[PDB]
């Protein structure tokens, strides 16, 4: 289906790419999922977490507080869906592996395996920034996981360029 996403490179027939503040994205484009960089407890401190939650006035930490009391922590490499709040119909949480928990890499492929579950995205790449993955490797494993559309938001520009020119 046509969709309202603009200004995206395209890497393969369902990931797409584009220099953005997914905060910004989101609330442009009011996409059907939303995806956080979240950790098992849903604690949105800082990262893409902290920005999202920011911007839904703290609503997304409040929701949050509420499924871990009722759940419990998520695993990693695991998910849950939750409101998108003013960004979205949904918020996907997703658990990327943070090495500066010495968290096993391998997981990140399970963690993007969750992105199945949605027909079309807009996402962050999984465990980069203060996860400590390195982006490249988390954009190889997107790119042979996700078998949906997904729109990858990428703020910083510097690493755009680079993930761009070295794609393979």
Known sequence: MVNSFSGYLKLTDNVYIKNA?????????????VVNAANVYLKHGGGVAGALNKA????????????????????VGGSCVLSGHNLAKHCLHVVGPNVNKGEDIQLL????????????LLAPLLSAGIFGADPIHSLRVCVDTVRTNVYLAVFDKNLYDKLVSSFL
């Open 56 to 75: 839904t006035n703290n609503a997304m930490q409040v929701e949050s507080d509420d499924y871990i009391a009722t759940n419990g922590p998520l695993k």
């Open 21 to 33: 503040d997914i905060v910004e994205e989101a609330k442009k484009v009011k996409p059907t999922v």
């Open 109 to 120: 492929k399970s963690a993007y395996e969750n992105f199945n579950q949605h027909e079309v």
